[PDB]
Amino acid sequence: KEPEQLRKLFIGGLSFETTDESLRSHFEQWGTLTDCVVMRDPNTKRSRGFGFVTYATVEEVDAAMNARPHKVDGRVVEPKRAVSREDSQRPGAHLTVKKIFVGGIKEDTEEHHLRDYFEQYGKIEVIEIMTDRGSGKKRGFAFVTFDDHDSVDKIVIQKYHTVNGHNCEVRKALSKQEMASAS
Template identity: 60%
Template sequence: MSVSGENTTEELEQFRKLFIGGLNYTTTNDSLKEFFEKWGEIVDVVVMKDPVTKRSRGFGFITYSKSSMVDDAMANRPHKIDGREVETKRAVPRDDIDKPDIAWTVKKMFVSGIKEQTEEELREYFGQYGNILNLQIVTDKETGQRKGFGFIEFDDSDAVDKAVLIKSHEVCGNKLEVKKAVSKDVASAARGHRGGRGIGSGRGQAWRGHNNNWGGNSFGGYGGGSSGGWAQGGPQGWNNVWGSQSNQRGWGNGGGNWGGSQSGYGGGPMRGNFGNNRAVPYHTGRGGGNFHQNSRGRY
């Protein structure tokens, strides 16, 4: 069986980076580094600050020297820093920020491109990302023929986050694409509750049994708004964590929200080694510097 991606891409920075949300305002670069270095060597750390007030924005990023250290840190959740439990997630590359499903916190993922792979082969491959609870290869109810897609449910949302960071997966010579699976009911609920901290959140909110009817009787496919279809839209409560400097709607502003109304939590700037000069590290859309922040939360 071919296992692609892991050997060739695991040391790219995007696989070594963590987003830390809900930080205590007193948490500094040094205290954040001190806490997370118990799981490995940290090459970069930053607590994001308001460029005007210099006050903590309540979130930051950690970059390890090896991706396995991220796995160790995530395996030891929850984390409590300076008296406050924080939200730890794998950081999202800037190119993926606008993907509608990227911000969801779910334990179930959609897999497309399935051909002749058996359930056992899929379990063997995707089992490297976490403990699989359920795996379903979808077939036509009348003919029994495969529809080319399926679903995998893990016991931890981090397994899904890790799998979707890889653009494509090769299993038995065929490429498979993965996305976070979100029922239409959950997507609709999220749109009606802006400012939430993600759907699911490990508390079983996302999957309420068969009544959600994943795709209805026809399994109308992933995406689109047709009856029985799948919702690809991200929760409206996750906006640009970088935020508008005028309203500061990101992490740590007292409301405990991820942000305003659209994008994901962000991937953070891809930086060099810990201790680099940060004279002008993060810009707010007024020109200059390498990491330009715009209204969509990218850099």
């Protein structure tokens, strides 16, 4: 049994008329659900427009995501890997992005180093190992862009990532303005 956090998905843009029952009925098609709930306003019961579903294994979760697009109760919803409450605290933890910031890589890191670790998560479209302007000096970080935002979500939810023989920190990429607006 893998952690509950990794066996759960956030479902956004849920129809006004979706209830635990209708949600379950749709997602059980891809595996055994251990949890399924529509979040409602703790007072008016009114649906908050989002919920979560949890499967018995992450294999079943992957199957659900490969099943995209998902339409529930006639509305196109948006399934996503569940970000933990703690990580949801971080700036832009819930954005839908295709690029990741990879920090703390050794100087001699080369593109094949990044590929041998990241390719297992999805199709890579771009790889950029950053250097200093005019100096040419390596800056110790890179940006990797995928073809599916889910490749990125599957990555960031993990804690460790080994590249060029050592662990590195990986986070969703924030734009120049998002960064500055986060500090």
